[PDB]
């Protein structure tokens, strides 16, 4: 059973799934838009939203928090200095997901884009 359990497993063990979200986070904050499978995409939203929210705090503690997932000082500088300010007045929802219309040839996986909001 699965009654009221939150969080996909995505056929990865605990530490892999973690790495999965972190690496997608790096890619998303870097390029502003990535393409993935729909499930990875919906699952990416929250993980990254939290990171943006902390960069809106701006303080040392929050930077050191974000660094635990993002690990890259420069990318975090980009997060704090360029990205986060765009969201000063925005109350959550800093990411969107829209499904592409074509499936992967080799396995038929449904794709979606995940991008940062304006």
């Amino acid at each position: 059973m699965r009654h009221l359990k939150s969080g996909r497993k995505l056929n990865r063990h605990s530490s892999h799934r973690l790495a999965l979200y972190r690496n997608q986070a790096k890619s998303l904050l870097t390029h502003g838009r990535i393409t993935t499978t729909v499930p990875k995409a919906k699952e990416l939203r929250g993980f990254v939203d939290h990171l943006i929210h902390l960069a809106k705090r701006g303080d040392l503690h929050a930077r050191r928090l974000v660094l635990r997932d993002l690990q890259d000082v420069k990318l975090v500088r980009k997060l704090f200095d360029e990205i986060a300010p765009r969201y000063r007045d925005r109350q959550g929802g800093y990411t969107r997901v829209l499904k592409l219309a074509e499936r992967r040839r080799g396995d038929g996986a449904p794709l979606a884009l995940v991008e940062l909001v304006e």
């Binding site: 829209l98 499904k99 592409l100 219309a101 074509e102 884009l113």
Partner: protein, 59 residues
């Protein structure tokens, strides 16, 4: 186990009765309100790049 096995060959009738559920359902499609091309709903239109009124994507 002790290796179960078909006792009798399946008749042309029975094998085809099994397949009475195997027909594909056609893809569900809707016109893109911009370029009028046919595409699945709730997907960014892959011909013009529009969704929810706006241009989202380079086609």
């Amino acid at each position: 186990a002790k290796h179960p096995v078909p006792k009798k060959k399946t008749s042309k009738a029975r094998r085809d009765a099994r397949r009475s559920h195997h027909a594909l359902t056609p893809p569900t499609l809707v016109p893109c309100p911009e370029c009028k091309a046919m595409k699945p709903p709730h997907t960014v239109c892959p011909e013009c790049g529009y969704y929810a009124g706006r241009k989202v994507l380079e086609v």
